[PDB]
Amino acid sequence: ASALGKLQDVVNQNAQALNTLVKQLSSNFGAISSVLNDILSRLDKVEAEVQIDRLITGRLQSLQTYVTQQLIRAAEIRASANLAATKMSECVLGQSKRVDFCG
Amino acid sequence: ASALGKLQDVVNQNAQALNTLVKQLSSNFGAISSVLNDILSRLDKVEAEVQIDRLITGRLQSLQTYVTQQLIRAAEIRASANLAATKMSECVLGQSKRVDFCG
Amino acid sequence: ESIVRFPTNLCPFGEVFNATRFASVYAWNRKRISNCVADYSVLYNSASFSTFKCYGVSPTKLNDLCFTNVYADSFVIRGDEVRQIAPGQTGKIADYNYKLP
Numbered sequence: 001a002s003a004l005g006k007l008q009d010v011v012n013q014n015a016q017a018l019n020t021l022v023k024q025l026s027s028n029f030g031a032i033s034s035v036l037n038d039i040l041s042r043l044d045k046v047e048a049e050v051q052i053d054r055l056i057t058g059r060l061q062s063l064q065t066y067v068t069q070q071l072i073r074a075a076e077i078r079a080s081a082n083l084a085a086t087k088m089s090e091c092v093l094g095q096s097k098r099v100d101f102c103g
Numbered sequence: 104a105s106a107l108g109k110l111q112d113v114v115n116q117n118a119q120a121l122n123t124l125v126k127q128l129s130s131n132f133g134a135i136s137s138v139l140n141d142i143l144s145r146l147d148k149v150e151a152e153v154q155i156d157r158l159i160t161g162r163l164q165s166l167q168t169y170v171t172q173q174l175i176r177a178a179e180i181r182a183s184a185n186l187a188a189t190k191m192s193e194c195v196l197g198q199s200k201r202v203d204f205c206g
Numbered sequence: 207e208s209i210v211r212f213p214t215n216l217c218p219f220g221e222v223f224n225a226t227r228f229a230s231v232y233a234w235n236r237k238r239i240s241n242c243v244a245d246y247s248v249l250y251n252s253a254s255f256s257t258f259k260c261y262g263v264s265p266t267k268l269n270d271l272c273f274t275n276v277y278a279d280s281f282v283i284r285g286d287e288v289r290q291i292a293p294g295q296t297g298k299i300a301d302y303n304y305k306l307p
């Protein structure tokens with residue numbers, strides 16, 4: 001089952017960061033609680049404003065972390081995709097003279 | 104006019120993020136106003152310090168967003184540039200034996 | 207060089223702060239101060255008010271800042287009642303007779 005690790009790693013890392021991205025919802029980020037309503041329930045808004053910032057600032061940052069990862073990770077796949085499209089064109093469709101490009 | 108989309112997309116996305124980067128100047132980011140002087144002319148400094156943070160923290164972050172985008176986007180162009188320099192060398196200057204590399 | 211541009215006349219602050227009678231907090235008469243030039247340094251220098259408070263502006267920077275229309279709310283309340291009305295703070299005065307944004 002380890003031959004497909006390359007694929008298996010891609011699928012995992014995607015599902016990985018999603019889990020991480022989700023678990024970031026449950027973190028306090030310095031706010032009094034991770035449930036967005038509890039801060040609204042317990043506290044009068046004027047103070048709760050500052051609290052929700054630490055959630056937003058935390059979460060909103062936590063997206064840019066996730067987004068930036070995907071961009072970087074996609075740029076790898078984008079490179080790997082061309083490698084395939086190169087092989088598919090040269091190796092499959094033609095015959096390759098490039099030593100050990102096709103294996 | 105859609106044949107040049109590849110170029111047209113590059114030029115747009117650059118001018119795109121710049122617009123976005125500019126429009127970030129007009130956002131409150133939790134501060135009382137987006138004009139850096141108003142916080143100074145409508146608030147004794149000792150408190151205005153904390154306000155300008157939310158501008159700076161917001162804006163200073165908003166650069167790293169823009170910068171990181173450019174880095175990532177340039178790394179794509181950097182990959183596309185080599186593809187050209189590869190074609191220019193192999194396809195134009197020589198004759199390519201690579202099937203469907205030159206089209 | 208600095209070229210500040212202003213549009214003079216005179217703003218009747220003296221009538222507002224030295225009106226023999228002040229309206230009740232629940233019902234008060236808005237007064238429009240406009241088409242005039244207002245100096246806040248003279249009010250600060252006189253220091254007739256027991257305390258000078260600016261939630262919004264800074265009193266020193268009031269002269270530097272420009273406001274097209276000045277509106278004054280005149281009411282009489284106890285000193286403890288003045289403490290109740292503040293931005294971000296719930297007060298008995300805020301709850302019924304008057305509200306501050």
Ligand SMILES: *[C@@H]1O[C@H](CO)[C@@H](O)[C@H](O)[C@H]1NC(C)=O
Pocket residue numbers: 219220221223224249252254
């Ligand atoms: C109101 O009366 C006080 C005390 O006489 C005076 O200093 C002040 O200048 C008067 N009003 C204004 C703001 O002109």
